[PDB]
């Protein structure tokens with residue numbers, strides 16, 4: 001199934017934050033309505049916050065996360081969870097190798113903000 | 115129901131990161147085995163990271179997040195979500211006022227690391 | 229925070245299913261637009277499906293689950309999770325006593341159907 | 343990433359319930375320790391419960407859900423979510439066709455029971 005694609009409320013600000021846990025340098029690209037809106041990168045095996053940014057989901061609300069290492073796309077896992085019918089998290093894990101810890105880049109999208 | 119309390123696997127490193135979305139200064143306390151292990155404080159209405167740290171869950175695995183604003187305890191919401199049977203998120207929102215956006219401090223715990 | 233309240237897309241069929249795990253007879257009421265639309269009762273300590281049914285979310289999309297044991301309301305927990313940006317689960321646990329297993333009545337709402 | 347595989351606490355009873363939403367007949371196999379422990383089958387486009395059972399997770403706790411339709415395995419999506427640190431749901435959706443609604447067999451595992 002497709003992973004890393006979320007329909008957010010239209011025209012709404014959201015946070016997107018990436019954490020690294022791998023010997024490989026991660027590159028995280030965040031697309032809004034199919035165009036790159038943020039790129040984060042770094043290399044840590046201790047959960048460094050390699051990027052965090054506030055973006056607007058735009059008129060369609062479509063947000064997609066893709067992760068690569070060495071130009072090679074990582075395998076993604078994702079889900080969205082909503083607490084008390086209002087607080088939202090869109091969650092992504094990714095695997096760049098063979099150990100299947102899926103934490104090599106971790107991306108959290110949260111809304112609403114403010 | 116109690117919120118903000120999670121049982122992690124014992125003796126396991128985990129990340130904890132907090133964001134703020136309120137006019138009030140947030141104070142986030144993280145307890146491991148009922149003892150304070152990290153404290154973050156800051157103010158933002160734009161989802162700024164007010165702290166990030168790596169902690170060890172110790173022999174009990176018990177981790178608790180508590181949020182207060184000028185000593186006033188915030189009401190919490192929380193859940194844990196596991197992707198591909200590997201990647202864990204323990205998520206907390208909190209409310210310091212009346213609007214019930216529950217984003218006034220948002221805390222993300224993630225494991226495994228590395 | 230409020231629990232057991234979910235906003236579904238309007239005029240959409242959804243499934244609601246209740247399980248019991250308690251010595252007390254559970255009463256589960258499912259409200260759509262603040263009016264009872266399904267009701268299930270029963271006693272099990274083995275996860276009996278005390279009822280399942282297909283409902284329509286109607287014009288408001290507002291769905292609320294209430295649980296009681298001989299008229300005494302149980303304490304609720306809930307969340308919603310979305311898989312591959314399309315498959316929705318609204319989840320409820322409830323506690324009728326002191327042990328805080330929160331499984332005394334468990335309710336799962338799922339959509340879309342068909 | 344692998345989907346439909348969950349590690350439960352060892353030697354713990356859990357409920358498993360399957361719903362169908364497709365023209366095709368669904369066969370759902372539930373494996374414990376890599377051997378089939380239960381099989382459900384049925385056809386519905388109205389979310390009928392095609393099976394429900396209580397099983398033991400056994401010594402290893404490894405539980406896997408597989409879904410077959412028309413002679414081929416369906417594509418799965420899954421996650422686990424824990425409420426109030428007590429109540430566990432392991433959730434599976436599956437796609438047997440081309441519309442990507444992922445509801446063709448929906449499987450809910452819940453624990454603890456009793």
Ligand SMILES: [C][C]1O[C](O[C]2[C]([C][O])O[C](N3=[C]C([C][O])=N[N]3)[C]([N]C([C])=O)[C]2[O])[C]([O])[C]([O])[C]1[O]
Pocket residue numbers: 021022023024045095096097098099100101102104228
């Ligand atoms: C730490 C770690 O990181 C990572 O892993 C890795 C892999 C994948 O990426 O890879 C490997 N390799 C590399 C090479 C070059 O040649 N080879 N092999 C590595 N190793 C070394 C020794 O280097 C590793 O590290 C991830 O995935 C994991 O999870 C961890 O984090």
Ligand SMILES: [C][C]1O[C](O[C]2[C]([C][O])O[C](N3=[C]C([C][O])=N[N]3)[C]([N]C([C])=O)[C]2[O])[C]([O])[C]([O])[C]1[O]
Pocket residue numbers: 114135136137138159209210211212213214215216218
């Ligand atoms: C922005 C916002 O923030 C917050 O809210 C707030 C409240 C609660 O906290 O409070 C109020 N107030 C304060 C005071 C002092 O005295 N009074 N009242 C505020 N307002 C003002 C004008 O200041 C507000 O702001 C939260 O909760 C929300 O959500 C938002 O974020």
Ligand SMILES: [C][C]1O[C](O[C]2[C]([C][O])O[C](N3=[C]C([C][O])=N[N]3)[C]([N]C([C])=O)[C]2[O])[C]([O])[C]([O])[C]1[O]
Pocket residue numbers: 249250251252273323324325326327328329330332456
């Ligand atoms: C099995 C169980 O169930 C339940 O718990 C119960 C409680 C709450 O509900 O309660 C009690 N009690 C009752 C009475 C009348 O008289 N008293 N006390 C019971 N016990 C007996 C002996 O009966 C119990 O059982 C729930 O919550 C739990 O979780 C379990 O399931």
Ligand SMILES: C[C@@H]1O[C@@H](O)[C@@H](O)[C@H](O)[C@@H]1O
Pocket residue numbers: 342363364365366387437438439440441442443444446
């Ligand atoms: C009636 C249809 O049957 C199969 O084609 C399913 O894959 C569709 O999702 C739909 O349920």
Ligand SMILES: [Ca+2]
Pocket residue numbers: 022095096097098099100101102103104
């Ligand atoms: Ca890895």
Ligand SMILES: [Ca+2]
Pocket residue numbers: 021022101102103104227228
């Ligand atoms: Ca890793």
Ligand SMILES: [Ca+2]
Pocket residue numbers: 136209210211212213214215216217218
């Ligand atoms: Ca607020």
Ligand SMILES: [Ca+2]
Pocket residue numbers: 113114135136215216217218
């Ligand atoms: Ca706020």
Ligand SMILES: [Ca+2]
Pocket residue numbers: 250323324325326327328329330331332
């Ligand atoms: Ca109970």
Ligand SMILES: [Ca+2]
Pocket residue numbers: 249250329330331332455456
């Ligand atoms: Ca019980």
Ligand SMILES: [Ca+2]
Pocket residue numbers: 364437438439440441442443444445446
């Ligand atoms: Ca389908």
Ligand SMILES: [Ca+2]
Pocket residue numbers: 341342363364443444445446
């Ligand atoms: Ca279908």
